[PDB]
Design a binder for this molecule. Structure first.
Ligand SMILES: CSC[C@H]1O[C@@H](n2cnc3c(N)ncnc32)[C@H](O)[C@@H]1O
Ligand SMILES: CSC[C@H]1O[C@@H](n2cnc3c(N)ncnc32)[C@H](O)[C@@H]1O
Ligand SMILES: [K+]
Ligand SMILES: [K+]
Ligand SMILES: [Mg+2]
Ligand SMILES: [Mg+2]
Ligand SMILES: [Mg+2]
Ligand SMILES: [Mg+2]
Ligand code: NA
Ligand code: NA
Ligand code: NA
Ligand code: NA
Ligand code: NA
Ligand code: NA
Ligand code: NA
Ligand code: NA
Lengths: 380, 380
């Protein structure tokens, strides 16, 4: 009756995550000056290079060199010995205005509440009662392992650490009337970029004792747990030098770690009219409201849109058998309690606020009591 | 007892798909000369620009200018009036060798069958008996609508069409003991780039009569079906000029349209040692083998890897209640019939063959009897 499930996470210096953070730093910089900025900022990173490409129409005056370099500094890439340096890297900008054909079809001359979706697409939200924050344990643990690495790097206790890391956690679960119950951790992987001087045994010992044991409750770890710590054997070259990064290439890390579902759309670098982000945040909010409201133990919500059309084209609720109410009844409750037009979501979730860089590492969900993490009290 | 489900697809000239196709054209060009090429080629597209960034170690001599421009020509961007021209665009190359630290940990001095996974990660395969090709009807129809647009563009019957398109299909389904049964098409969206001269009513009439009715069986369409055809009202600016493209930003279009699950890893631009692609293809092969073998009607397969380790860390089977056998029994059948090491998958699925550009539009699954689409006869 048990099964395995695996999720991964990556650190702040993973090259794809660097791009997500830079894209959201650019978004935040625009929103600080122009709350109605239209932003679709993609970032690419390779050895010595950050390239910004995409479309921004905004009244803000943004110094892209400063914004990009400050984001890279925060991540920790500050010296050529680490493979990347905010002070001396190339920052290239290929940003144009938003297409006028898009603007006229989406938002020009429209009442804000009745703004059209900025694109077509589908989005999902998910929630599970297996943790208090209503997220899968596999990804929660994977994120926390990367956060612990960054903490021990920044506090100097493991000074050989560099910012690029990846983690992966496999949990054995049992099923319980459609809900899932974590039993034990089956396998953990950690790979992290390191300096030239530290040896492999020192790193493997530290990763077990100072990282894993600091993060994962002992009750989940036993004599059979498998550890793959620095499994490649050597990871000195890292960051964009080791692997090109792009915005929107960590969409499963950003969401539910393989649980639930995903509609395909990236979050970072996008203002609220891009429903890939706003409607996925709203769908999370719905899912978490249903679980915290006691209606379900686990739930998946789908929504979809057409460019230029305000109301969603479809809404669907899947409760895995974890409610006494039918999925049709839950759908009716959702329709009575939520208005999923983007021009209403923006108000409910405060999506003109420049908090997006905070979302761009360690997952967008299950953390920090963002508005989409505060359950709505449901009337039914 | 019914529910809605929505999936989308995009055309060959959608800027993200342009990038996937170019990345796979580069991969194929290397494999034609060096079957053991190590390729991790990302492409970015914006107005007037294709940038290649990533890591390739290969004995091939590849003319990137020619390979990129020939791919763009095939897609149909051949004139400045269309917003992009293979003859005159900028092609920039930022390609380096594969990191030596990766190479030593993955494949150097290893027997091919015992090559390590080229990265950690998780991957899923899915199959559903709702269509003969074992794919969800929503995405099959969405892909076919884009293919029809390209056909009518290329044969000159709708000469106002340009290559950038998106489609979205919402189907009403019923549930049947864990399997799903399509009932009707609830909503269709089509947006496609067009010339300056054609008017909106002409386009909407053609999209209904010459595209939708040519693709979607009439039995699924009724008086209540909702059509959003050119919903933005104007789409003259398109391709990379309208929206930046990047490789690996259509991973749900490339797979199951929101059904099943996704592990997050992109396919295009990657050789077989990158398990994001090879293990997802193998997982599809497993799933389709279970459904075509009569063991399940619908199934989701998860696998995961650690960099440098050959055997998967975890394998999981979820049959939605559509088998008389338990998921544990199915897992045992899978373990007895499949060897999911990358250095074995490469042999079973012929993954050194330069056929990858053919996979990079209209989905990687459900088409053309690729090796992962030919079911394995199972012994149990
Ligand atoms: C294998 S390339 C994909 C990711 O794996 C990590 N990586 C890079 N080099 C190594 C290495 N030598 N060993 C382990 N992981 C690595 C980086 O996070 C990179 O973005
Ligand atoms: C809205 S930007 C995302 C995608 O939508 C499409 N698109 C671009 N411009 C328009 C438009 N004016 N109307 C409808 N869809 C568009 C392109 O396929 C683009 O890559
Ligand atoms: K990459
Ligand atoms: K884009
Ligand atoms: Mg990546
Ligand atoms: Mg999208
Ligand atoms: Mg895109
Ligand atoms: Mg990956
Ligand atoms: Na503005
Ligand atoms: Na899942
Ligand atoms: Na989304
Ligand atoms: Na709230
Ligand atoms: Na080679
Ligand atoms: Na799904
Ligand atoms: Na994958
Ligand atoms: Na085969």
């Amino acid at each position: 009756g048990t099964f395995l499930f695996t999720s991964e996470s990556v650190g702040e210096g993973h090259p794809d995550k660097i791009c997500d953070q830079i894209s959201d730093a650019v978004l935040d910089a625009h929103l600080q000056q122009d709350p109605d900025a239209k932003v679709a900022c993609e970032t690419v990173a390779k050895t010595g290079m950050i390239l910004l490409a995409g479309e921004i129409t905004s009244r803000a005056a943004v110094d892209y060199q400063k914004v990009v370099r400050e984001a890279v500094k925060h991540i920790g890439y500050d010296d050529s010995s680490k493979g990347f340096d905010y002070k001396t890297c190339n920052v290239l900008v290929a940003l144009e205005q938003q297409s006028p054909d898009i603007a006229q079809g989406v938002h020009l001359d429209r009442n804000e509440e009745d703004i059209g979706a900025g694109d077509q697409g589908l989005m999902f939200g998910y929630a599970t009662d297996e943790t208090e924050e209503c997220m899968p344990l596999t990804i929660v643990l994977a994120h926390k392992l990367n956060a612990k690495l960054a903490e021990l790097r920044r506090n100097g206790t493991l000074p050989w650490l560099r910012p690029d890391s990846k983690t992966q956690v496999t949990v054995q679960y049992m099923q319980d009337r459609g809900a899932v119950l974590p039993i034990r951790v089956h396998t953990i992987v950690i790979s992290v970029q390191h300096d030239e001087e530290v040896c492999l045994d020192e790193m493997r010992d530290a990763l077990k004792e100072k990282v894993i044991k600091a993060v994962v409750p002992a009750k989940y770890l036993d004599e059979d747990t498998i550890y793959h710590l620095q499994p490649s054997g050597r990871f000195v070259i890292g960051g964009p030098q080791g692997d090109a990064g792009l915005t929107g290439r960590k969409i499963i890390v950003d969401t539910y770690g393989g649980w639930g579902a995903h509609g395909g759309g990236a979050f970072s670098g996008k203002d609220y009219t891009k429903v890939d982000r706003s409607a996925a945040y709203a769908a999370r909010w719905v899912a978490k409201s249903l679980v915290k409201g006691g209606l379900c133990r686990r739930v998946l919500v789908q929504v979809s849109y057409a460019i230029g059309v305000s109301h969603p084209l479809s809404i669907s609720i899947f409760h895995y058998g974890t409610s006494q109410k039918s999925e049709r009844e839950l759908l009716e409750i959702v329709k009575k309690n939520f208005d999923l037009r983007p021009g209403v979501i923006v108000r409910d979730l405060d999506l003109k606020k420049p908090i997006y860089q905070r979302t761009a590492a360690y997952g967008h969900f299950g953390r920090d009591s963002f508005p989409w993490e505060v359950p709505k009290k449901l009337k039914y």
